Amino acid sequence: NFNGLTGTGVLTESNKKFLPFQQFGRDIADTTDAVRDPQTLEILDITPCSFGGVSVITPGTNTSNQVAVLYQGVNCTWRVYSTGSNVFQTRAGCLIGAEYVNNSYECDIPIGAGICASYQQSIIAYTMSLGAENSVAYSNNSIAIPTNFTISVTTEILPVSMTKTSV
């Protein structure tokens, strides 16, 4: 608290010009992100305490019991206390309970920003794999003609109605 109004969040040293009798550098969101020290001519950037946002990545109950947990938007570059196996620092946030491999695999369970996880005898994480990559050669005369001609069937599902009701 400083001179009436209060706030909550971490405090850093500001680096911007302030006027005489300038005390609040409030932005278009009207948040006191910058304040003047009431003792010396010292300037403070105010950035609020970081929230979490917690998600759990786990296969089926019949499958296994090993889990992993993501706290999105957490710059571990911490606040984890009881750590698990390994820590990773996705652009989405801070992830524990899994490890990252140097290869890319199928995105069966997406984590985000190209990161996807799965289960090996362990829970693994990786970058998203685009698929099977091949380039067909092109020439001034190169052409391809199919030889065998097979028949496939596709099944699609489309809704029609819901439960009509009155109250």
Binding site: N140, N141, S142, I143, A144, I145, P146, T147, N148, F149, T150, I151, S152, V153, T154, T155, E156, I157, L158, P159, V160, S161, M162, T163, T165, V167
Partner: protein, 209 residues
Amino acid sequence: GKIQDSLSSTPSALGKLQDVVNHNAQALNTLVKQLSSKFGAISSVLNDILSRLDPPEAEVQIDRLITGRLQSLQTYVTQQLIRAAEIRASANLAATKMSECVLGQSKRVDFCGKGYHLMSFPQSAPHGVVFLHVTYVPAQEKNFTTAPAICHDGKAHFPREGVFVSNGTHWFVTQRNFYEPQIITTDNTFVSGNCDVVIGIVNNTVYDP
């Protein structure tokens, strides 16, 4: 022989209707569970309020209870409205698909199936429908050498329905999408222009009876 064992394998197929069914179910569960709620009321039962308290200052709880119930049912009916709109749009698309894929052979690629569409068959479902699209897919291929222009007697000729194919052993013309090695005959090619304006020009002979 696939599709039956394809449909009984996973519940992901009918899940596209199961989610709608259980979502309506849980919506009704939320509406029937919001009767026991606190809209600023001392108790969530109306006649208990009317019994334990005198009328002329009990309505200051009854009115806020009423407003809470009205807000709940208004949110419910608006969510029903938007679901009805999107399911009506999807059902109109389904009716169009039945009008095109089932009643004919549309040229809309990857719309009446996957690949070159041949057949479509509908099957009903509780508040739903499924389509069986019988399509053609090529299996495997082989590479060949291409030359558009065949100049016989100094005269350019282009194959009409298909292209020239160079087996190396022999040289034929086939159809556009598949192979039918066919000899050069006048009905397969049209004749136009000189022989000094084209790329892929080649020299070959032609048949006449």
